[PDB]
Design a protein around this ligand. Structure first.
Ligand SMILES: *[C@@H]1O[C@H](CO)[C@@H](O[C@@H]2O[C@H](CO)[C@@H](O[C@@H]3O[C@H](CO[C@H]4O[C@H](CO)[C@@H](O)[C@H](O[C@H]5O[C@H](CO)[C@@H](O)[C@H](O)[C@@H]5O)[C@@H]4O)[C@@H](O)[C@H](O[C@@H]4O[C@H](CO)[C@@H](O)[C@H](O)[C@@H]4O[C@H]4O[C@H](CO)[C@@H](O)[C@H](O)[C@@H]4O)[C@@H]3O)[C@H](O)[C@H]2NC(C)=O)[C@H](O)[C@H]1NC(C)=O
Ligand SMILES: *[C@@H]1O[C@H](CO)[C@@H](O[C@@H]2O[C@H](CO)[C@@H](O[C@@H]3O[C@H](CO[C@H]4O[C@H](CO)[C@@H](O)[C@H](O[C@H]5O[C@H](CO)[C@@H](O)[C@H](O)[C@@H]5O)[C@@H]4O)[C@@H](O)[C@H](O[C@@H]4O[C@H](CO)[C@@H](O)[C@H](O)[C@@H]4O[C@H]4O[C@H](CO)[C@@H](O)[C@H](O)[C@@H]4O)[C@@H]3O)[C@H](O)[C@H]2NC(C)=O)[C@H](O)[C@H]1NC(C)=O
Ligand SMILES: *[C@@H]1O[C@H](CO)[C@@H](O[C@@H]2O[C@H](CO)[C@@H](O[C@H]3O[C@H](CO)[C@@H](O)[C@H](O[C@H]4O[C@H](CO)[C@@H](O)[C@H](O)[C@@H]4O[C@H]4O[C@H](CO)[C@@H](O)[C@H](O)[C@@H]4O[C@H]4O[C@H](CO)[C@@H](O)[C@H](O)[C@@H]4O)[C@@H]3O)[C@H](O)[C@H]2NC(C)=O)[C@H](O)[C@H]1NC(C)=O
Ligand SMILES: *[C@@H]1O[C@H](CO)[C@@H](O[C@@H]2O[C@H](CO)[C@@H](O[C@H]3O[C@H](CO)[C@@H](O)[C@H](O[C@H]4O[C@H](CO)[C@@H](O)[C@H](O)[C@@H]4O[C@H]4O[C@H](CO)[C@@H](O)[C@H](O)[C@@H]4O)[C@@H]3O)[C@H](O)[C@H]2NC(C)=O)[C@H](O)[C@H]1NC(C)=O
Ligand SMILES: *[C@@H]1O[C@H](CO)[C@@H](O[C@@H]2O[C@H](CO)[C@@H](O[C@@H]3O[C@H](CO)[C@@H](O)[C@H](O)[C@@H]3O)[C@H](O)[C@H]2NC(C)=O)[C@H](O)[C@H]1NC(C)=O
Ligand SMILES: *[C@@H]1O[C@H](CO)[C@@H](O[C@@H]2O[C@H](CO)[C@@H](O[C@@H]3O[C@H](CO)[C@@H](O)[C@H](O)[C@@H]3O)[C@H](O)[C@H]2NC(C)=O)[C@H](O)[C@H]1NC(C)=O
Ligand code: NAG
Ligand code: NAG
Ligand code: NAG
Ligand code: NAG
Ligand code: NAG
Ligand code: NAG
Ligand code: BMA
Ligand code: XYL
Ligand code: XYZ
Lengths: 757, 758
């Protein structure tokens, strides 16, 4: 129903496309099928070579915190954790660092970053942590910078997952072992998404990935309107490849492809894993595609366009003239692949300190009745296995960080489970960072780290230790992983119990939370014995040494929440995860654009901590809001260009031009130096519009007491537009826009009204 | 009475302290005498009653031999065992001086330390052997001297313990009487039946050195000797200790060491402890009862004045009247026995952490090295054992005596043993922490499996998947033991056996580190070529990791040596080392005589695995040029107190402790690295049934460079070359050929020569 436009190279890949075209033009049918389907190798996936032309096997490798399965590398903080920095410089630098390590391990294509699938419709999503903000605008800037940093290191990106992949449950990878297939049991969950919602929420971050020059995009496991993502013509050929003007390849999820012919006709470029994983995740092209070309049902012109999309990245990143080194680790594992591993160390100086700065910039202060910052306390108590090592080793949970037992004390939660985890060379534990600082103050320190419910004597030891401590730290965690959603907000392990004991025996409890998402702390958050509360997300290998300096006030906290923290799972979008045994499971996105905070705002629900909330050790006062209509500029800077239709198109201009700039002033009005994330929210007029939508942020660094700084927010045409289902285009409405500036999504003291002319 | 109580006279250094003590005691009522000589209730292990009228406060008596126990704000020092392994006199003294400063700043008058030859080492299974030092009278004696000296130099009176022949914990049998039913109705204490020669040449040796250093008090033991209780043994206390050793200080009971009012008063006891403390459950035989014994004529008032004078001598000698200790603020008894709140004081001084670390670095003993040590810069490191990290319940979770955690709990690094000799910790620097630190400096990876390998799901699989790819795997092992029990055998604590099976199965470069209270069984793996090195680190206190890692990486070469013998089997030691019996009067017959630890091995031609005095370095040393200088003698001027030990060569001017000659030898560093060497001297004294050889000297040369030489020197005292004549009741230098041997261990003695006296 929607025809596949041919690739032409767009803006920045013109010469790379031309080499890709000339190379493909000399290929046999048997060669075209080789490069478009996966083969057996050491990496997550591997394209077939075209050996007659000197095109090698491309190594495709997970994942969104760095190369997975690999020794000799670093464990970076997750996307969640960089999001909470609200710092553009760090978002870029992390991706550049990941890229360096991908390149040096010999990866051609990184299966990274996550750029808005999952976006955040449900805060229970098992792999929400792999992405960044539950907000299209901020997820969009984060995705732009993440793709830029990876591509600038010389690795091709595969941005994922396209699209509306918002729950793990019933995602239902294609699996066929013993002749019984997943198709005989249950189809994938189907996101039924209206067109306005697709344009204004889910496509937004992908447009940014495309503009930043993402080389490839991964389709998703879910169906959309009862059509598989990997063979959805409206999705791939029309929305992605026509409207977003995407010039790269679509890569299948591993078990994302369910058929041979529709996938070919409808926009898929690469079948993965192909012959990897014994063929059990389907092997629908390869020789079957040769047959389909030669027997006439799939055209050779169509398949050539797939190969050109694959080769465009190869030539634009200069992998022909500067090939990556060889890839030496078996990341698949026996019995699936029998193959020894080499060894390579790629950790560069500077990487560890970068990982620590992202942790120190993201730790988010939620409550502080005056216990923080610490001074030089003499007697410190520490609770929870989250304060120390996994008792079986940092990497004991295996190549996907998901094979340890349900009750294992996994230690500090530095990453989540699944394809987006990575190995850690060590873990810097909160306990050891705390002890180091205790020794400097000549203090004492003791930690109870066992399970408080099941270890003989643990409850007594807690009761004897806590009453004489000046401060007691409670470390809590909540592991989640790809493949399942969290059943609710409950804390992991014995957390509930550690809290019940902590508040019973101590009056100065400081809680620290390592987590993949929102958790339930309602029983304790208003207890006056809990004097402070911090969420550190998934900080990677520098867990303790990033946190402790914030606790002791060497650096004031400046992280803010990148999603909403509701009091109950009941306060979020209804039917966040659908559980059914129907053969055709359905998820209807009837909420439309109202997910996360925009659902809270429209329903008049008050969260415990709102989107964009974080405390500091000082306070900031906002003043002098200026809307400068004189400060406009053409968009010149993008790597690639969309073909997104809009009403004000004149043949030269762009949906992404800056049409005006907004300024405000902040003043440090407390007693310490501190950083501040300023945020700008826009109320677009129209019917059934979000109360307010984030459209800017700007983080001021280390503003001294009594000093002032100007904060600046460039507003693009698209930032102030709506999508017209009837006209099929973006337009700026006439009407009153409200513009608000402040320190969180509910704390906005500056406001003004803009009416277009 | 056959053995009468001599009166105190103040001896050499306590003359004026004795006169102030006598001044005060002379003014005392019978009620006041009885108050100061018996324990009362308070915050410390024991408290003497005040003499309120004369301004004598309560004296705080506080455990223990690693520093003040049950107390926050202090440091956890290494155990005696550990400092013995240094063979370093300087560290022996400095350790006790620091414990001293901490005792004193915490408010302590009398420290229940050090342990100076009870237990000595008759059995390597003794649950509290680790509190002491060497299994050898000479070396124990030198360490006791210097420990008493350090503690008394700091301002705390010492109570050296345990007199005497207290060589097993089993059936030590404290006196306990509660609800009308007493330990006397169940079983008497084990009886150490010791002949006179053995008492003089073995068990009294360390105690004579403790006396000469000015130990202010001595504690008697739980054992009976020849079926008479130590705390009321007249031959023991009045004759051997107060007459022959000329002891001028007080005798304090063990807690539950006193079994009677009257014989104890007559036969040498000076202080009853704990008295009214511990609910009077441990006996309370004096107090009001002694007041009655004096008033009604059974016990002489003058005997009791002597006891008070002995107590007060220390108070005045150490200047506790003009420089009182500050108040003692911690409840170290525990609820429900004592319901009282604790204050807080911090006495940790800069410098103390480094000293503790230095003792650890100097004691770690290298027993095997096929090439794997020192490490260079390994890139992938595996670590096994909960001994590598924290007690999962907290460093102090095991309570005020380090003995109240479950039999199966993961106690983390064994930094001290259990019982009255332990102490709390402000933190523990774990081996894993310190290794990680070094791993990060080298851009390496590191991973530890620290769960119980037998009983945690997935633990054996994690060990199997982690080990094969490591460049080096460290396995940490431990063996807790405590006061009140003897170890049943040499087996490793916890899952040690299983961790060793796994480690040699999956790795070819295993380095084993043992934290232990004594010898353990590693026969199954010590000869496995995959075990490329083995170190024993004893009980290193709070600086466990950071004392160890610099040795392993070669910043410092190891220089510790075993302070006891490591046999292949328990069956190779002195038989009947621990007696087990339900007889009412259990007997232990010391029929081996002076032949314990290495003298037993040497006499019976038994080859130990690792001998007494053994320890490798990262370099080798060559011995040469043995010289016996008969002209380098000197009179003993410098002891704090004098014994009255009779000897045949007495002329009115001279001493048993004169140096009569001096021996010299030369070491040369003959390998490729700088290193320190502990040189040792052994003498074969001629006569009937004499040890093959006996340690009589040691000297540690620090940081000898490659190709350099240094002279080692061994002053030989008259007593070092004497025997006890049972017939004549005196020490004498026998006629005959004495062989003098010098070298690097008790079985690596390349230089020898012969000395003949007439
Ligand atoms: C998954 O399923 C959903 C549900 O069906 C699919 O959404 C649909 O996507 C379609 C595009 O692929 C949309 O088609 C357009 O519909 C326009 C008319 O819109 C009304 O029609 C129906 C009437 O029964 C109604 O559903 C719509 O109501 C929704 O929107 C309004 C407003 O926000 C709300 O009030 C309602 O709640 C509903 O949510 C609308 O009221 C139609 O004008 C439009 O026109 C064409 O555009 C094309 C392509 O460029 C062109 O060929 C045609 O010529 C025509 O354009 C012409 O007209 C305009 C002038 O009017 C001119 O500018 C042009 O240049 C040209 O001359 C188009 O057909 C469909 O409405 C939308 N439905 C919903 C409910 O969202 C979703 O895409 C599926 N996704 C996937 C991945 O499959
Ligand atoms: C625990 O039980 C043990 C076992 O009973 C107690 O040991 C005993 O300690 C006694 C001292 O309290 C020793 O007494 C001396 O014995 C001398 C005689 O030695 C022989 O006699 C008996 C024969 O039946 C025998 O036990 C001994 O055999 C042992 O030793 C030899 C030699 O090494 C070995 O071959 C054997 O295998 C045995 O181990 C002996 O063969 C005796 O000369 C000595 O002399 C007196 O000293 C006192 C006090 O100062 C004095 O009153 C006397 O007049 C006399 O000395 C005078 O003369 C000398 C010169 O002759 C002069 O220099 C003096 O100044 C003075 O003018 C004394 O009676 C007893 O031998 C010993 N037994 C054993 C087996 O060791 C042990 O002490 C008990 N411990 C406790 C804490 O109670
Ligand atoms: C240390 O780190 C360890 C890992 O290294 C942690 O261990 C892992 O912990 C996770 C939980 O965090 C654990 O999760 C699985 O537990 C069992 C597996 O036996 C399953 O119940 C879980 O999946 C279900 O539960 C979810 C919530 O209720 C749900 O989101 C999910 O999708 C799934 O539910 C389906 O299954 C049920 C029927 O059987 C239905 O009720 C439900 O509707 C769902 O139906 C759908 O799927 C069915 C097929 O699966 C299908 O038939 C149906 O029609 C429909 O499609 C969950 O994965 C891991 O097992 C555990 N790992 C191991 C190895 O034990 C550890 O906890 C951590 N420690 C600490 C202290 O945190
Ligand atoms: C972690 O730390 C904790 C302490 O904080 C350690 O736990 C303690 O470990 C000790 C082992 O070293 C435990 O010792 C006792 O075990 C039982 C208790 O019921 C007891 O029978 C034993 O004493 C007897 O055995 C030996 C040898 O056979 C004798 O020397 C001793 O005198 C006792 O025998 C007597 O009784 C027998 C008749 O009943 C008779 O055969 C004999 O004749 C003899 O007279 C030990 O006392 C200790 O209980 C344990 N503590 C607690 C509170 O549970 C823990 O092990 C450390 N963890 C690790 C992994 O090492
Ligand atoms: C279809 O794709 C497959 C899989 O990539 C192509 O087979 C593979 O061809 C490559 C050469 O491009 C072989 O790798 C080379 O191996 C040699 C020595 O064994 C080595 O020295 C080179 O550096 C290089 O790595 C690879 O082994 C081979 N694998 C298999 C299973 O055959 C195949 O040729 C493609 N077909 C066409 C028509 O291009
Ligand atoms: C026999 O010993 C008992 C116990 O030592 C003596 O009673 C105690 O006497 C002391 C004074 O020497 C009292 O201590 C003081 O307490 C006050 C607080 O009330 C404080 O101001 C002082 O600094 C000091 O600590 C203590 O109250 C008291 N204890 C008991 C249990 O009564 C008794 O005096 C002695 N008998 C004779 C005859 O000397
Ligand atoms: C073309 O070949 C394919 C692949 O095997 C086969 O399934 C299909 O039916 C063929 N078409 C015709 C018209 O024979
Ligand atoms: C707060 O802690 C104290 C002990 O420090 C406890 O007794 C009190 O009940 C606690 N209060 C609450 C509300 O949990
Ligand atoms: C999804 O929506 C259609 C809309 O008309 C409805 O019939 C269906 O029941 C809805 N939900 C499910 C889970 O089927
Ligand atoms: C003296 O007093 C003691 C202790 O109360 C008593 O048991 C003993 O029988 C008395 N002795 C005489 C001879 O009265
Ligand atoms: C030494 O370790 C290897 C594994 O590295 C194992 O195969 C071998 O059997 C071990 N050797 C012995 C003697 O235990
Ligand atoms: C101990 O010694 C004597 C020999 O002098 C003997 O009567 C007794 O039976 C021995 N006891 C044991 C238990 O060996
Ligand atoms: O608890 C003391 C134990 O040791 C001693 C034995 O003789 C027994 O009475 C008991 O089993
Ligand atoms: O397991 C889910 C992941 O998305 C996989 O499909 C691939 O490794 C690509 O990320
Ligand atoms: O020093 C006090 C303790 O020493 C040991 O002898 C006993 O447990 C107590 O007496």
């Amino acid at each position: 129903q929607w025809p596949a436009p041919l690739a032409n190279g767009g803006k920045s890949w013109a010469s790379a496309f031309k080499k890709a075209k000339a190379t493909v033009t000399e290929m046999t049918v048997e060669e075209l099928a080789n490069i478009t389907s996966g083969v057996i190798g050491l990496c997550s996936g591997v394209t077939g070579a075209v050996t007659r032309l000197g095109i090698p096997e491309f190594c495709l490798q997970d994942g969104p915190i760095g190369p997975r399965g690999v020794h000799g590398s670093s464990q970076f903080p997750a996307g969640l954790t960089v999001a909470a920095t609200w710092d553009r410089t760090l978002m870029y630098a992390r991706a550049r660092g990941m890229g360096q390590e991908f390149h040096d391990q010999g990866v051609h294509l990184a299966l990274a970053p996550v750029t808005g699938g999952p976006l955040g419709r449900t805060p229970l999503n098992g792999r929400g942590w792999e992405g960044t903000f539950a907000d299209p605008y901020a997820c969009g800037e984060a995705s732009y910078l993440s793709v830029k940093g990876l591509t600038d290191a010389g690795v091709a990106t595969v941005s994922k997952h396209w699209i509306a992949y918002e729950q793990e449950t019933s995602r239902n990878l294609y699996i066929d072992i013993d002749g019984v297939s997943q198709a005989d049991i249950q189809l994938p969950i189907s996101s039924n998404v209206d067109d306005l919602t697709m344009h204004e929420l889910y496509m937004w971050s992908f447009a940014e990935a495309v503009r930043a020059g993402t080389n490839h995009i991964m389709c998703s496991y879910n169906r959309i309107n009862n059509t598989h993502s990997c063979s959805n013509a409206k999705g791939l050929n029309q929305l992605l490849k026509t409207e977003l003007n995407f010039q790269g390849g679509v890569v299948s999820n591993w078990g994302g492809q369910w058929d041979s012919v529709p996938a070919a006709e409808n926009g898929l470029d690469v079948a993965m894993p192909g012959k990897g994983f014994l063929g059990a995740l389907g092997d629908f092209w390869g020789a079957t595609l040769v047959e389909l070309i030669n027997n006439g049902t799939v055209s050779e012109d169509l398949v050539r366009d797939k190969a050109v999309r694959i080769l465009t990245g190869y030539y634009y990143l200069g992998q022909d003239t500067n090939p990556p080194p060889p890839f030496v680790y078996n990341t698949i594992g026996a019995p699936t692949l029998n193959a020894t591993s080499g060894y390579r160390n790629v950790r560069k100086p500077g990487t560890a300190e970068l990982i620590k700065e992202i942790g120190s910039a993201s730790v988010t202060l939620l409550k502080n009745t005056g216990s923080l910052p610490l001074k030089h306390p003499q007697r410190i108590a520490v609770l929870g296995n989250d304060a120390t090592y996994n008792v079986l080793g940092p990497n004991a949970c295996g190549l996907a960080n998901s094979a340890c037992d349900i009750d294992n004390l996994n230690g500090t939660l530095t990453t989540g489970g699944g394809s987006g985890s990575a190995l850690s060379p060590y873990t810097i534990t909160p306990l050891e960072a705390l002890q180091k600082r205790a020794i400097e103050d000549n203090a004492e320190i003791a930690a109870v780290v066992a399970n408080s419910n099941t270890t003989t004597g643990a409850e007594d030891a807690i009761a004897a230790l806590l009453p004489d401590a000046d401060v007691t730290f409670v470390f809590l965690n909540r592991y989640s992983e790809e493949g399942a959603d969290a059943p609710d907000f409950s804390l992991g392990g014995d957390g509930d119990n550690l809290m019940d004991l902590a508040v019973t025996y101590s009056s100065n409890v400081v809680v620290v939370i390592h987590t993949t998402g929102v958790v339930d702390i309602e029983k304790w958050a208003d207890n006056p014995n809990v004097t402070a509360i911090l969420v550190a997300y998934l900080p990677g290998q520098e867990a303790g040494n990033s946190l402790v300096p914030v606790l002791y006030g060497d650096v004031a906290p400046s992280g803010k929440l990148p999603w909403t923290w509701g009091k109950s799972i009941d306060d979020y979008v209804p039917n966040g995860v659908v559980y059914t045994d129907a053969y055709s499971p359905q998820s209807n996105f009837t909420e439309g654009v109202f997910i996360d905070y925009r659902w809270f705002d429209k329903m008049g629900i008050t969260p415990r901590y709102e989107f964009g909330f974080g405390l500091s050790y000082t306070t900031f006062t906002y003043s002098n809001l200026i809307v400068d209509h004189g400060r406009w500029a053409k968009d010149y800077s993008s790597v690639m260009e969309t073909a997104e239709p809009f009403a004000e198109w004149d043949g030269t201009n762009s949906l992404y031009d800056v049409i005006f700039t907004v300024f405000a002033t902040i003043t440090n009005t407390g007693n310490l130096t501190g950083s501040e994330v300023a945020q700008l929210y826009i109320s677009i007029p129209g019917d059934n519009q979000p109360v307010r939508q984030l459209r800017g942020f700007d983080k001021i660094k280390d503003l001294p007491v009594g000093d002032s700084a100007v904060v600046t927010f460039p507003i693009r045409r698209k930032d102030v537009s709506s999508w017209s289902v009837v006209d099929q285009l973006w337009y700026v409405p006439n009407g009153d826009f409200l513009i608000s500036v402040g320190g969180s999504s509910r704390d906005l003291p500056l406001n003004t009204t803009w009416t277009p002319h």
